[PDB]
Amino acid sequence: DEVKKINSEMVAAKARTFRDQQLEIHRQMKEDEKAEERSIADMLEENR
Amino acid sequence: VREIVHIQAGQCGNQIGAKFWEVISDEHGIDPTGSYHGDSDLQLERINVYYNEATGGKYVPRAILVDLEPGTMDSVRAGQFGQLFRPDNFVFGQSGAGNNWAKGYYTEGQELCESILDVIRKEAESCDCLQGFQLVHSLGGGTGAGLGTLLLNKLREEYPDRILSTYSIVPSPKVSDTVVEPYNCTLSVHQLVESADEVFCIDNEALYDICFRTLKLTTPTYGDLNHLVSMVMSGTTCALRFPGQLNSDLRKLAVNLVPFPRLHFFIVGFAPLTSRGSQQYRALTVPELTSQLFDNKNMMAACDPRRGVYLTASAHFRGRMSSKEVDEQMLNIQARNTSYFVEWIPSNVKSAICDIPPRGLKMAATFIGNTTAFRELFTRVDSQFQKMYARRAFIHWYVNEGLETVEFDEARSNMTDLIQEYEMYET
Amino acid sequence: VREIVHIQAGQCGNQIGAKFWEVISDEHGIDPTGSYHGDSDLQLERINVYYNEATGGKYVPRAILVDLEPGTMDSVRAGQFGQLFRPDNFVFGQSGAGNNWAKGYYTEGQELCESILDVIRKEAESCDCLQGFQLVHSLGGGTGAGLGTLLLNKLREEYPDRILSTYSIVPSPKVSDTVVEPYNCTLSVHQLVESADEVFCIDNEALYDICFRTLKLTTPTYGDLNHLVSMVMSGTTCALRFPGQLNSDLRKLAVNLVPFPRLHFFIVGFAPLTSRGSQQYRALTVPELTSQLFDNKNMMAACDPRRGVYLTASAHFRGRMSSKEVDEQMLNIQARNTSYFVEWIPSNVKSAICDIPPRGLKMAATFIGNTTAFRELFTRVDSQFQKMYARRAFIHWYVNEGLETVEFDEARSNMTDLIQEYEMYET
Amino acid sequence: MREVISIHVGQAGVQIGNGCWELYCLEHGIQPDGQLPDAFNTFFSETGAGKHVPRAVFVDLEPTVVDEVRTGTYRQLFHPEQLISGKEDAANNYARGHYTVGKEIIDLTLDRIRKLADQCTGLQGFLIFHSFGGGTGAGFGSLLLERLSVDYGKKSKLEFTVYPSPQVSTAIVEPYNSILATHSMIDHSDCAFMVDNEALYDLCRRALDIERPTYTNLNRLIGQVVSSLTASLRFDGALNVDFTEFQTNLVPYARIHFPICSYAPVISAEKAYHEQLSVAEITNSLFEPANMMVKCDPRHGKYMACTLLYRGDVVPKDVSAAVATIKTKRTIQFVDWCPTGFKMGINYQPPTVVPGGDLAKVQRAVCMLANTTAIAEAWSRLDHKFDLMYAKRAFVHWYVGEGMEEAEFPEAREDLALLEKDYDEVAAES
Amino acid sequence: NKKRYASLSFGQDNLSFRRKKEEMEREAAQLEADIKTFERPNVYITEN
Ligand SMILES: Nc1nc2c(ncn2[C@@H]2O[C@H](COP(=O)(O)OP(=O)(O)OP(=O)(O)O)[C@@H](O)[C@H]2O)c(=O)[nH]1
Ligand SMILES: Nc1nc2c(ncn2[C@@H]2O[C@H](COP(=O)(O)OP(=O)(O)O)[C@@H](O)[C@H]2O)c(=O)[nH]1
């Protein structure tokens, strides 16, 4: 019953890899967003 | 990790160093009183490179400041970060500069050098993992042009192994301020060629030109000019202070960018630069930085590389970024303009990545390069120095200090040989 | 992927280009501050064609603005969407327009061209698959007429492969507003024929006729006048930006419409147009659009195609509609009026359908045609130029800038040859 | 019972080593604190009380990156004695790292490995990693291998080095260090594999879906190959493969040891869910030139050595069928004097993936290590690049002052020329 | 006391400055001696 290896393999980490990568995106795009905000703060100070 | 001693000479050197220490203190997050007040643990990992420690929770830079007249030293101490410097480090005489190279070299130079040597040796032996010394001076006036070379000769004599990296303010060939300036630059070059391992040239014309081309500052002063110079100051040593994906110290740059011992004069460039209005519009990518770095307008040297050719180049990038993106940009920029690079040196470019970016900027990069366009800069002064030397008017001010005429003859012959050597490597 | 670079020259070009950017900004849904606030996700599918990305979710158009006088740059900055354009891209001179072709081409053209080329080169590298360059300029005065030819020649030298398309305004036969237009137009024709692959000619008089006939504007202005031209530019590029049942880009259009290299001057038209109180009665359908498109009154060039013969033409439709209905309408119009078309080129009219229609209109269409009716426009300027140049001393104004009188004869000889080529291919 | 000692030099070695030992801890099930929540003896040592220590030695002339490991999460796992750092780097100079600087730290490192060698009763060989373009990787590595040759005699010194890329270069003095190191290990190295960053850059983009790669991804892919190579001796299988077995088969002569490597299947996390991945599919994907991590086209040359290693749900019947099908490919050429040229091994343990990684779990996988005459493409390219420099003496002055005698430069050039001629002679047919 | 003493200049000699620096040094010595005298934990005095 090799399929036991097939199914016990496929399920756990690959599906979790999807959610982990999906979570990684959710961190990243607001990570840059707050990098942008602190840059905008650095405009207003340096402008002054 | 590897400590460096910083040396400043002249009115130009002290003010530039003052802004340089402001930038370093800001990036490490050191309070003006000398107490660390930062926000990240990475700042204290390797802060011993430029700072010492006192038994009061305080830090003191390894800075040695030299002048002939005490006016500049009091101005430096009066600054916002004046207290940060050790009181004894201020070494100064009670005589004016005189604007004469010979007067500073022989009369005042021999008097001051003995005391400065002891002060430097105190800082030199205060730490064991020693890298080479750093010098900032100007070649126009008397104190910087003469004393800086005399100290450089002593530094080479005592510590042959260490790297003597120097930064020089080349006399602005069309904007400079001193009548006898061609004499000072002519004489100082001879000492600088044989002693200094690394020489970087900065022209005030370029600083004003870059400021009005890119930054669009309404009322520029030396403070803004010193800040732009300080950016290259901090970017050069960045790999030493902070981690990176490919480390590169000064010795790495010297080995890669110097094909022959007398070819070490370099031109430096910085990116990104933006007017205080326009930065809403930029994308902050490696191609964006590459476009600014390789552009001739951003070069703080009054020479156009397109008139000459490259034979060595290097760039240091600061930030968390791709190795592959830097590899692609350098490969494309090398292949796209192949006419400007000599054939007998494949891969004329060098790369290095440091992980920690400067304050406020997610991406930053510094370009140090070499080209045969240096032949123009020294030709300008050589042609003028010939005009003075033909009529021999102002020589009497240099003879009165005991300087022989052969010093002029040997100096100009040295520059002429240097220009010829750069001419041969055109082919 | 198939990006497009836009260039605006002179007074007429900048005002039309501003309206051109205003319409497209509304079409994609870009708020005047530069941040997306649209409603449909299809708008961001291919915004890279015309828009660049700035950090912070701000989009900046690939716009290059050139003029010799700063007053025009004052107007676009003060406009509603002035803040959208990149401030560095605003390149301008500090002298008057001069109302002269030679003055713009030689005196100030050489000074400005280098800076313009570098600025354009910046945007040229910010696009993977730049399809071609787009120019909007007028042939009347000499600022756009003179400098635009120099820029177009230089761009062809740099980018031979890219499709260069220009939108030019010709001097009106009756509402001409300069004593010396025929000289400027005659000189510009020589460069226009050899450089640009696709040329679209629009005359002010036909625009006044269209507005007064259909739109019923009591007091029409340039803003109302330029709206129709903005629609024509928007319709042409709609295939690249949005899906369609039959995509048709510019290079498809050039292959179909151009039988021979020199025969590339085209006439454009737009449908539907209706007076602001007459829209209730119109049951707009595909045959109704076809009736408007091929009607001679809706043509924006003051040349009746009926007097001449038709070469290959193409029509682009926007919206949802039956392919069979569209295909049947062209076959009917092609066979019904066979006298208008040349017999030796069957299938004279080309089709193309895009799925997404413009705002407010359930569907719309655009017409582009090639015909021998352009000979009337060249005849008008030739007859005027002949009576101009008979008084050969009036050329002295162009002589001051370095224009030798033999240039006028050579330009007219080339322009006459273009007329003759149009005559032979009639049969 | 059986042990392998790992040695890492240069910045490249330590980050590759960091990527490797991260996988092994997850693969054997070792927590970062050294305790547990087997094959441990091969790669870890037990000191009682349930604490494990790796059999690894990291050496560098810079103190920078080694300190970063000392401050990393895995700091408690590694012994301070194992991690050795220097005082000043070689600055991409082979002269500086070989005579002047490297000769200071050579004795201390030799003492450490000998100390760690005592605990390994079943020690069968060493694994060594290099940075060819770096001064420390080449300058210190040549001295280390020269000493190791006489210190232990008949011990398998296996190497995995980063050869310069055909086009992408980060050092202007890269050709000099590469050839001088090439002259060095050609006499001492038992078997050294070659990989280049440019091929790994392309593979991680064309096959794997990471739009914007970094060095970290390259290290993980390298670690997977190393793990599969040594996985035969860690777990049960129908056909175990020992290091001596590779040494006997993969080389037909002493000087022709240089193999090329392949790995399959590399695939994105979701592309594997929509594919079959049978034995034939993974086997046929290996032979494609796009999967080679050395940027040389195998069609130019010929094959005279191959070794299959299987880590997956694999039955020997399919392996024989896959090999037979590959044998019929006329796009693949075999030398006349090597009729079989294959050895395959079967190991049941599937490859282990990393959370937050890039590789999809692959329920059955196969590794390739082959020797071909196509490697002569890389040797020639470095030769012309060197001749472009040395004809005008571009950077000679740095090396001479740091201990290099100029007579060594033609010696390395002549040695490379002899090796190229030797490769061509073997490629010939009778 | 010490902060003001830090706000002094080099190479300067004037009886006004010299008096200030001299009195500055003498005042510092007095205050330090007072601090050292008062540094003891036990102080027996007869207040006036
Ligand atoms: N693929 C990959 N290559 C690396 C990595 N780190 C370093 N390298 C390689 O190492 C080369 C640079 O040399 P170093 O890593 O500094 O090694 P080194 O011998 O210590 O060099 P020196 O500092 O001059 O002594 C680069 O060209 C890379 O090819 C890495 O993390 N991944
Ligand atoms: N960029 C910059 N230039 C300076 C500054 N201070 C002085 N300079 C210039 O540098 C030159 C200094 O001359 P210098 O050789 O130091 O005079 P010396 O005292 O006789 O040695 C002058 O010509 C100044 O124009 C500064 O703070 N920033």
Ligand SMILES: Nc1nc2c(ncn2[C@@H]2O[C@H](COP(=O)(O)OP(=O)(O)O)[C@@H](O)[C@H]2O)c(=O)[nH]1
């Ligand atoms: N349709 C239209 N025509 C304009 C506009 N602005 C100027 N023009 C026309 O452009 C013609 C010439 O303009 P000019 O300033 O000489 O442009 P130049 O050729 O670049 O110098 C004039 O006859 C104007 O009527 C506009 O906004 N719309």
Ligand SMILES: [Mg+2]
């Ligand atoms: Mg290294």
